Structure formats: structure tokens, C-alpha cells
């Protein structure tokens, strides 16, 4: 609870550990192996269904980016 004034945000992502190594691996390439999608879930601590649903999570959540540039609304 520190750092400079003003914040503007609202809901907040999982870990900083989780959303850097989802879109790391997928950034690297585009989808990790079960070992790989494991580590994952095992440093996030999830399910591996939960990952590889991390993975079209992403692809879903990453969509709703360049669509506010312009901010016509």
C-alpha cells in the first residue's frame, strides 16, 4: 500500500508470478507441452485444466486489448 497517488483500477489479476508465466509461454511460442503447461499450474497452482483454460483465457482476455485505442464510446 504505497507508491504515488492515484491509482484508477478496479478487479485485479490473480498472481504476478501467474499472469507472467501464462503469457510468457505463450508469447514464446503459443502453447507449452503437458510438462511445460504443468510447471505452470504447478508454480501457479492450479489443475492443468486449469492452465491450458488459462491459455484461452488469455486468448480471450487478449482480444480486449487494441479495441480501446480510439475509445469512440
Do not use: C
Amino acid at each position: 500500500m504505497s507508491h504515488m497517488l492515484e491509482g484508477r483500477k478496479k478487479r485485479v489479476p490473480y498472481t504476478k508470478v501467474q499472469l507472467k508465466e501464462l503469457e510468457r509461454e505463450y508469447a514464446t511460442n503459443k502453447f507449452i507441452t503437458k510438462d511445460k503447461r504443468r510447471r505452470i499450474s504447478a508454480t501457479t497452482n492450479l489443475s492443468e485444466r486449469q492452465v491450458t483454460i488459462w491459455f484461452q483465457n488469455r486468448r480471450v482476455k487478449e482480444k480486449k486489448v487494441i479495441n480501446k485505442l480510439k475509445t469512440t464510446s
